[PDB]
Design a binder for this molecule. Structure first.
Ligand code: HEM
Length: 152
């Protein structure tokens, strides 16, 4: 449950991401994969990436980063009214990709890390609070769908 002012902060922060969705998406995934190498194993199409240099050079990783952040941005712009947008992602990530909710926590924190890394001094405490709450809401609603599906 975010206030109007918190959603305003979220969407203000998101404008930073939308200016360079592929660069943000790439860095989010690289942060996820390098911080939590087990997550790489969930991607048949990225498990060949042995080094961060290879990850950085991967155009397909940037492409997927764009897909991920485009989806997330579409969800965030719903300001919590995202059941229709979230449902297929929860279902695909539980049933097809088999992504534990822990990895969604990892990527949520990776987003925060990337925002500070790319916008140092420009991702204020209020913005971090609002973005964190929005990612918690996202993760929590996914978690509810995971529970429905019995997925761990
Ligand atoms: C912000 C959180 C995430 C968003 C918005 C997101 C979004 C997406 C989207 C839109 C797709 C393609 C459509 C689909 O298959 O449903 C996808 C595919 C996929 N996602 Fe995610 N995802 C997120 C987090 C994760 C995490 C944390 C993992 C694993 C650690 C993961 C693993 C995968 C895999 C393996 C695929 C299939 C990739 C392929 O083979 O093309 N996702 N994701």
């Amino acid at each position: 449950g975010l206030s109007d002012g918190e959603w305003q902060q979220v969407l203000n922060v998101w404008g930073k991401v939308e200016a360079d969705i592929a660069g943000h998406g790439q860095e989010v995934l690289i942060r996820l994969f390098t911080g939590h190498p087990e997550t790489l194993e969930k991607f048949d199409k990225f498990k060949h990436l042995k080094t961060e240099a290879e990850m950085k050079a991967s155009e397909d990783l940037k492409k997927h980063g764009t897909v991920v952040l485009t989806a997330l941005g579409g969800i965030l712009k719903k300001k919590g009214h995202h059941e229709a947008e979230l449902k297929p992602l929860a279902q695909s990530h539980a049933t097809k990709h088999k992504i534990p909710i822990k990895y969604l926590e990892f990527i949520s924190d990776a987003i925060i890390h990337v925002l500070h890394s790319k916008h140092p001094g420009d991702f204020g405490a209020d913005a971090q609070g609002a973005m964190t709450k929005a990612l918690e809401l996202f993760r929590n609603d996914i978690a509810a769908k995971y529970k429905e599906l019995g997925f761990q």
